[PDB]
Amino acid sequence: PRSLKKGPFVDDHLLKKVDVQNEKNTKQVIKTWSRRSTIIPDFIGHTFAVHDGRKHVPVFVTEAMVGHKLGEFAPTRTFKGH
Amino acid sequence: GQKINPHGFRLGITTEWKSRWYADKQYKDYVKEDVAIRKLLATGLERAGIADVEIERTRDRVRVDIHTARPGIVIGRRGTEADRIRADLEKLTGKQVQLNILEVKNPESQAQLVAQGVAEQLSNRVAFRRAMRKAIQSAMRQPNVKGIRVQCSGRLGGAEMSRSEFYREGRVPLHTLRADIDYGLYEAKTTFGRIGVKVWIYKGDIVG
Amino acid sequence: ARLVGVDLPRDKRMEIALTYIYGIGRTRSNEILAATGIDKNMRTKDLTDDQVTVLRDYIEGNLKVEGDLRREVQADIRRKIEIGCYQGLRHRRGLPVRGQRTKTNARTRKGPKRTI
Amino acid sequence: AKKSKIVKNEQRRELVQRYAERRAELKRTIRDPASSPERRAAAVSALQRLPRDSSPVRLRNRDVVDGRPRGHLRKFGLSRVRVREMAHRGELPGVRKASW
Amino acid sequence: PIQTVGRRKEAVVRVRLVPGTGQFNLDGRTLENYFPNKVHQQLIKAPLVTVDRVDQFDIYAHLDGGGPSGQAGALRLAIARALILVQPEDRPALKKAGFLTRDPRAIERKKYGLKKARKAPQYSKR
């Protein structure tokens, strides 16, 4: 999926939000609405609050989750049982 | 509803197309502006006796041959009405428009017009039975026919319960194909909704 | 289960016998036997020892096999997914990770049945 | 259907005609070939910043008569219902009942 | 010359018959490389066997359309029509044998609501 020639997809909003956080070396949480924007090896430490369907869902990125699409960390549905 | 459209049944043997052109890739927008045309002159001059809207077009022209009972209502005094509708069709154009009108010889023998008349007369005051019988009388007195069937369906007489009542005279062989069975339909507007008036007119078999 | 180069993995052709290994199917068997000089139409009873040695060293140099591969799989699942990813949540709850009807037929993951 | 929906489909149509002179095609024909130096371009960001309504992926094909999304047929611009009605009425040239 | 045609389940065949041995030129092939099935071969040669003119005629042909059995039945019809043209007085025997009758059977069209032109869906009452 997401052919390598096209490269990874990261919404420009989250990109301009995170590159400044890098170059100023601050890591306040980012209130980014879109999930879908593949985690790239640029912000392991910064925390995102992606899913806005119904909840805040912070997520601290790590080394272990690069390339994975950010919405995997933000389950939309809810099931506990019967 | 079980009966098919008689026109759709006898579309290539007895009846013919009310749109006479050809297209391959312009077919779509041709159809688009065609239905826009029909909607336009169905909303506008319903008071006139609009029956058929036979359209043709060849790459620079659109003939909009309509068939009417009251050309005096079609065209204004000095054709100002005709010029107005030519103008709005030349807006909604196939790059040029011409609008020769036709006068029907028999509003009583034209199914769509009979249904138009029944629809207008029934809503204001006349009973559906009176209107149906009057239409049938006029049609069968008109000589070309061989039979007629009229069907009014809805809140007849402002009733609380929909009724579908039909009258007839002569022969109406819908299952037969070699039969010029003119079909007409109109939704009479009423304070208690809408009344569907269907008309079938068997004006004799058809030649091969 | 006991041997990588099981001296008798099973008495039958080599192309299909080498598939009795957690990292070998039909095409890996074929390409192995092509890279070597071993016929594929030959049973394992007709083997030699040098054949097994070249197979073992080829395999251990080129590709992965039962223990290391199975550990790679399980470590991939746990570590690389995490505690709480989506595919990890659904691995945890025993349900089809890749997108599937859970409504009716997810039985291969859900088990035989738990009718209430 | 809803008038908002119909005019919205036509709005996206207008947006595609505007932003597809090449503003959505030069991008993809830059991304496809192997000689693409877009590693420094990253105009996929420009394509994101463009309206998502500028893409025909969002272009729904409603009927032109009533706006029905489903049952649409490209040869006619019409839903199945209107195709039935008009082919019966004789408004679709060549289209008649098939029986065989 | 003498040309005929045969048709059987949309399998057309053109047959140029000539006097020769019992040899075949079914699109550059022979009665065994084309129609290796003995049943098909029997079906081909039935008319010639009934009239007792095995090996009297060479048969060039241009089998086109349909499958093996359709093509075989078509060629059966075609050689029968050829035997009619070259010797009409064998008409009663072949007509009794049913080699002149072009089998009008064809695939029945699939029908809406069904699956296979008569196979209807599985009908549950509940």
Place this chain on the structure above:
Amino acid sequence: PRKGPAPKRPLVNDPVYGSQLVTQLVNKVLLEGKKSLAERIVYGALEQAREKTGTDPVVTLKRALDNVKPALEVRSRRVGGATYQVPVEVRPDRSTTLALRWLVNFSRQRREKTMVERLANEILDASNGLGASVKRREDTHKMAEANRAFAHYRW
């Protein structure tokens, strides 16, 4: 078939042996319209029987049919209470069809790793009067002779 009996289809005669009967066996062995394969199967089983017993395989087949085909059959009839089995005389064509069907089905049941082999062996031990097809025939006759009391319905 309320209006009447339908026409029995005319079978083609096999060219390898000259037999409506082997054609019939082919049509019963057939599956999924695989006529050529069924021909191969039947031909192979007949030639295997030939290689076995050194005789005409069609004749061996007819012998097996003679040993397998039933003259009597119990047909159910829901008389008041439990169902009554009624013995009736089987027509020749019905007997032949039942015999071929039983041969094919019992072959499909048994085990020789190949339909040709198991069909040939079923044919052979039925020709001898041993196989499960003849067992089915004998059980059929036993049931009919038991229920011969109810034959007087004779419908």
Place this chain on the structure above:
Amino acid sequence: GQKIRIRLKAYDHEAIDASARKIVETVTRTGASVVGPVPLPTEKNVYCVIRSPHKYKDSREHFEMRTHKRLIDILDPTPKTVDALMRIDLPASVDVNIQ
């Protein structure tokens, strides 16, 4: 010179046959030789429609667009013939293609 390959499409076989007859009559009036109105195959564009607007998938109507096609290869070209076929009028229900 070059022959030309007037291609006729329509939805009505008698109208298109009439057009072809008119065309051969024209070019023969103005002195040319034609191979004829060769009757090409007919396209049959089928469409299956659910009769009802809400349900009843098992009740369909099959509508066909049966496009008829003839081709006219006129030999012995002459500007007489060219202008003749330019100025001949034909109905809107027939499409001509000049080649």
Place this chain on the structure above:
RNA sequence: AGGAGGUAAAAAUGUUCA
């Protein structure tokens, strides 16, 4: 046209206006 007797074992019920 003239002329004995038969068999189907049991197998229930049906909120609303209508």
Place this chain on the structure above:
RNA sequence: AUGUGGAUUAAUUCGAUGCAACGCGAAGAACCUUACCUGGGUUUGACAUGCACAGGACGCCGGCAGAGAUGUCGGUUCCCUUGUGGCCUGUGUGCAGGUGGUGCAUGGCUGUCGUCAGCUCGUGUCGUGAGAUGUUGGGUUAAGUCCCGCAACGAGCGCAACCCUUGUCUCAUGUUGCCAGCACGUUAUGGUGGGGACUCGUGAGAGACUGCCGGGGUCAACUCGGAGGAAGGUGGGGAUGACGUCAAGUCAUCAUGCCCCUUAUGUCCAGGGCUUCACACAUGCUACAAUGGCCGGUACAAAGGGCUGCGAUGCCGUGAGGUGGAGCGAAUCCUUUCAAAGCCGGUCUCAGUUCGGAUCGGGGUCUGCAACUCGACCCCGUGAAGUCGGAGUCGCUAGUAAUCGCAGAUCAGCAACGCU
């Protein structure tokens, strides 16, 4: 896999509930669609049109912030002739707008009993009358089809037929379609000159009508058999659904009476959901194998689709696919010179198997702004249940069932194993 129920859910939009709902509306849910949820905006509104408005801009192009809607900036920003028409601007005013409700208010469309053959009427007659007769009776028919009788005589809708397709043959016809007869091709083939012979295509026509023969029968319908014929008895199949029922289905195609919202029950955007899952039902696909699997070789199809579409040779990849774009608006070219099952050979040798392919791990491609929820495809690896399925149950009478593959619509892509 798909749909449904139930349960979950913030939402899992709505409708469809025996036959006649449950691969149905959905002939194409990632965003859109989408109607649902959360949140962010908007309000004469996303679209209209009539009235007073003051303008020349409306608007388009870019930038910045924002998830976006949008907002805020900067450019480029009217003809006409003095009154203007258009355009917006707001003040609003009317009002638009509602996939908001009632299909027990409705049209239209449809299903269904049922392609069953029946349903009716006029006049006359019988009866106090409801009603009957006709339309029953004998026979025949697929048929209220027809005959003979008959207080009925007749007619109409239905039946049948007229229509399409298939099946045979003639006349015309040769192109892009065919190749018997000539030549040229020597590779790669009707490939090219050529030719109407054949096919085929598509226009017209003949043909099947119990027409003929024999026997039965009211001597009648009609029936049994035979001839000839491609076909024999409505040839095969479609299309065709009477009067009406189920207050069947649809106010979510549309239209629509009445009711309800009009800083929202409208409307823009974003996200998510419609794909949940302890389960149950249903329709299907794939299987459980040897009538088979895999490998190699070799044949035979139809029908259909293609312009911002089909996409070829060639080259790179293992392979999806990439490259490039020949040639094609298509009887030409592309969709391999289209198949698959099949045929021949080899191998496996009855095993949870070289069955089965799910599920899962990894690596990819393509689409599209974008494949986490949530796509398909490819490759490597994995290799579950399943040993022919309880009660019970379904379809099918011949080119049928069973099986095989092929094409199309919707469609960027596909969840299509579906539908046609």
